[PDB]
Design the sequence.
């Protein structure tokens, strides 16, 4: 049940959803 | 004198 | 049940979903 | 039940899903 | 004197 | 004097 | 004279004390991260 | 004189004390990460 | 004189204390990672 | 449409950045210590 | 449409970055120590 | 459409980056020590 | 159009 | 149009 | 268009 | 130049000097 | 130059100097 | 130059000097 991103901890980076 | 120091833990359940 | 990304910990990097 | 990526720990790298 | 120090743990369940 | 120090753990279940 | 230190502790912990169950932990003591 | 240190501990832990079950842990003590 | 150190511990642990069951652990003490 | 992410970094570090030289580090993530 | 990710990094480190020279490190991730 | 990921890194490290020279390291990931 | 992105590090000593 | 983005670090010593 | 991306590190000593 | 103890980090234990 | 104890960090324990 | 103990990190234990 997710079309996108679910991040717990993010340091920098690139996420395209 | 005599020094005595104890402790108990009676745990029923 | 996921169309995207689920990241626990991310340091840098690129994720395209 | 996953169309995408599920990462536990990511350091750099590229993931395309 | 005599020094005595103990401890008990009676755990019923 | 005499020094005595013990401990018990009676664990029923 | 004469030093004398007596210590006596009885400890009882229940199910999950001080636990990190299901936690997400990012930790850093020094070092460098260029993301 | 005479030093005398007595110590006495009775410890009882239940199911999962201090555990990291199912945890995600990223740790760093020094070092370099160029991501 | 005379030193005297007495120590006495009774320890009881239940199912999984201090365990890392199912954990994801990334650890680094020094070193270099060029990702 | 069309996504477009540009990123550009120039980094310069001098002698000892983020270092733990001569440090005393005691670290604990979960676990049990009965001292 | 069309995704486009550009990334570009130039990194320069001097003598000892992120180092643990002469450090005393005690580390623990889970586990049990009965001392 | 069409994905396109460009990546480009130039890295330069000096004498001893991320090193553990002369360090005392005690490490533990799980396990049991009964000392 | 044309996309151009560079970087220089001239380090004399 | 043309997108251009650079950077310089001239470090004399 | 043409995409060009470079980088230089001229390190004299 | 020390008659005693010099401890950096101490967790429990007994030191007699 | 010390007759006693010099502790940086102490958690419990016994130090006699 | 030491009559005693010099401990970096101590977890339990007994040191008599």
Sequence:
């Amino acid at each position: 049940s997710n079309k996108g991103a679910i991040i717990g901890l993010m340091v920098g980076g690139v996420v395209i959803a | 004198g005599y020094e005595v120091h104890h402790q108990k833990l009676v745990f029923f359940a």
Observations:
- The beta strands of chain N are 8-11.
- The longest strand of chain N covers residues 8-11.
- Residues 7 and 13 of chain N are 20 Å apart (CA to CA).
- Chains N and E do not touch (no CB pair under 8 Å).
